[PDB]
């Protein structure tokens, strides 16, 4: 019962570390994801300047 | 012991599946990671081109 219990006791934390550390990577996701559509879009108009200043140049 | 194997084993199912919700969240963050270091490396290299064509010009 303490096998289970312990295991247990061990399996759900686990878990709940695991829960959270889905949360985390999600939550680093998502802020990631937040973070390459930013780059993504701070890239596009880096690109468009660089366009822009070739065309200038 | 088997409330508890059974807590224990859908502990252990559920940190299965937590772990793949941050192994697929790793994943996703992971292949995120690999796009902010190539988006933001090209913003920086679009940044350092631009920097070259704002020079240049």
Redesign the interface.
């Given at each position: 019962?303490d096998k289970?219990?312990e295991?247990?006791k061990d399996?759900?934390e686990?878990?709940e570390l695991?829960?959270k550390?889905?949360t985390?990577?999600?939550a680093?996701?998502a802020s990631?994801?937040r973070?390459?559509q930013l780059?993504?879009e701070?890239?596009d108009r880096?690109?468009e300047?660089?366009a822009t200043?070739?065309q200038?140049?």
């Open positions: 019962l289970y219990s295991a247990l399996a759900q686990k878990l695991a829960e550390k889905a985390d990577a999600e680093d996701v990631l994801n973070r390459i780059v993504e701070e890239l880096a690109q300047r660089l200043a070739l200038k140049l």
